[PDB]
């Protein structure tokens, strides 16, 4: 929590709370200037609550006085905290104008709204004149700059507390908050700038949950020593596909190859295995003899044999979800002593007791529909629920990759948030590619958590490099863009 960090910085390091508040306010001014250019022609309406968010607001307003065309503060609170009171006092001593009554027409004489109503101190739903004013701002079409967090977003979860400000720019202090990272909060934040306001760097770095950055992924990418051969870069087996789903294995297999894996084999029911090599003859696609087009216990021994000569096994894409699949997946995972990447229909039939008894590592890659069925909760209770994800990973000794527009990656100790990607990934097949990518990076020597961190980043970044409209992106095009994502990352 930034709250712990503010407190320690004040009480133990000895930085006056007023100095942090001044630094906060001026970083808002500089952020606005970077975004709007010269501020001097603009008229500013600063909406201040009675808390420290409002106090930051008063610092902003005071620093604009005499330098812009107009500044007005609407003070919407009842009582003021001591720092808000101090900064209100300065704003007035410097000649600033404050009103306590809000007029619907007020928005008309201003170009920029600075939202300093509520920050991390929001508790409960917004109602009354707070709500009316936020709704009026959202209908106004003015430029909106939010202080710390858009008022109405819960900074720990990203949820909207009845209504919330939609900002063009949010300036936050020290570290991004969870509510800027998860949706709907991420959407209402608009462009996010993270300002250094003077916290010791040691405190800033000690936060246990963070955004996966380009620099983090660059330093995790495996080395490609020149004196190498395919064995240097590992082997993956993908157990995938069925009479119903002949394409999923292909997307997973190429996912492994495009991230640099040395050798990829699929095991796919015959004749569906032949589909893979008709499209990408660099893949090896082993025919598995099945009774009715689905993997079953009759195939257990062959798959365990194929697994002896690989570094990692991915299972699940396109398997189907029926009883013979369920028996195979669970007996296989119970006996397999290799890292496993478990996706799709392998999750849908997974007995989670099996994860507990496995000595080898696992990564699970559910979407929220699959996570919901796995833990027997509703989609809406698991979606963006990073605490549930953490508890699950810790209890089952795995890495959990919970896919969504912001993807959560956790082993129960460390939790990372991925924000690359766009809606071209909201289409069948995009998940099957990611499964291959993860197995691929594991085969090359990354830990399951590392492999997952790198893959979700690069997968999202590849989607963003599609040249035409994102809604037309398909999994095949995604594959082509992976090596461009890798180049641009370096």
């Amino acid at each position: 929590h930034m709250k712990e960090i503010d407190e320690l910085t004040i009480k133990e390091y000895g930085v006056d709370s007023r100095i942090l508040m001044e630094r906060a306010g001026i970083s808002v001014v500089l952020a606005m200037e970077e975004e709007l250019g010269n501020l001097s022609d603009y008229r500013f309406l600063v909406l201040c609550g009675g808390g420290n968010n409002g106090g930051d607001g008063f610092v902003v307003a005071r620093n604009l006085l005499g330098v812009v065309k107009d500044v007005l503060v609407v003070f919407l609170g009842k009582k003021k905290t001591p720092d808000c009171e101090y900064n209100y006092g300065l704003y007035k001593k410097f000649g600033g104008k404050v009103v306590e009554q809000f007029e619907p027409s007020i928005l008309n004489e201003f170009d920029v709204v600075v939202d300093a109503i509520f920050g991390t101190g929001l508790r409960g739903e917004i109602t009354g004149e707070y709500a009316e004013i936020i709704n009026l701002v959202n209908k106004s079409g003015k430029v909106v700059v939010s202080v710390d967090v858009p008022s109405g977003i819960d900074s720990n979860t990203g949820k909207v507390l009845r209504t919330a400000v939609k900002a063009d720019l949010t300036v936050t202090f020290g570290v991004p908050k969870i509510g800027h990272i998860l949706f709907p909060g991420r959407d209402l934040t608009g462009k996010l700038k993270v300002a250094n306001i003077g916290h010791p760097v040691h405190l800033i770095n000690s936060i246990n949950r963070y955004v996966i950055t380009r620099e983090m992924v660059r330093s995790l990418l495996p080395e490609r020593p020149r004196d190498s051969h395919k064995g240097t870069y590992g082997k993956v087996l993908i157990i995938a596909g069925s009479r119903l789903y002949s394409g999923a294995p292909v997307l997973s297999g190429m996912g492994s190859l495009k991230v640099g894996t040395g050798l990829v084999k699929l095991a796919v029911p015959f004749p569906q295995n032949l589909i893979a090599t008709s499209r990408f003859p660099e893949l090896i696609s082993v025919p598995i003899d099945t009774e009715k087009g689905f993997f079953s216990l009759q195939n257990l021994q062959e798959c365990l044999e194929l697994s002896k000569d690989v570094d990692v096994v991915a299972i699940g894409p396109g398997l189907g979800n029926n009883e013979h699949v369920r028996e195979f997946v669970n007996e296989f995972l119970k006996t397999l002593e290799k890292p496993a990447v478990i996706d799709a229909d392998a999750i849908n039939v997974l007995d989670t007791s099996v994860l507990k008894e496995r000595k080898s590592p696992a990564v699970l890659t559910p979407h929220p529909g699959e996570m919901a069925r796995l833990v027997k909760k509703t989609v809406g209770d698991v979606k963006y629920n990073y605490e549930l994800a953490e508890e699950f990973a810790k209890e089952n000794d795995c890495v959990l990759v919970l896919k969504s527009a912001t993807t959560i990656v956790t082993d129960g100790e460390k939790t990372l948030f991925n924000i690359t990607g766009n809606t071209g990934l909201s289409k069948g097949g995009s998940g099957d590619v990611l499964t291959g990518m993860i197995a691929g990076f594991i085969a090359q020597g990354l830990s399951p958590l590392e492999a997952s961190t790198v893959s979700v980043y690069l997968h999202g970044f590849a989607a963003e490099l599609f040249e035409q409209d994102e809604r037309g992106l398909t999994a095949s095009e995604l594959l082509r863009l992976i090596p461009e994502a890798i180049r641009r990352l370096k």
Binding site: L192, A195, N196
Partner: peptide, 6 residues
């Protein structure tokens, strides 16, 4: 970079 991260 001293003041702002994106």
């Amino acid at each position: 970079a001293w003041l702002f991260e994106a």
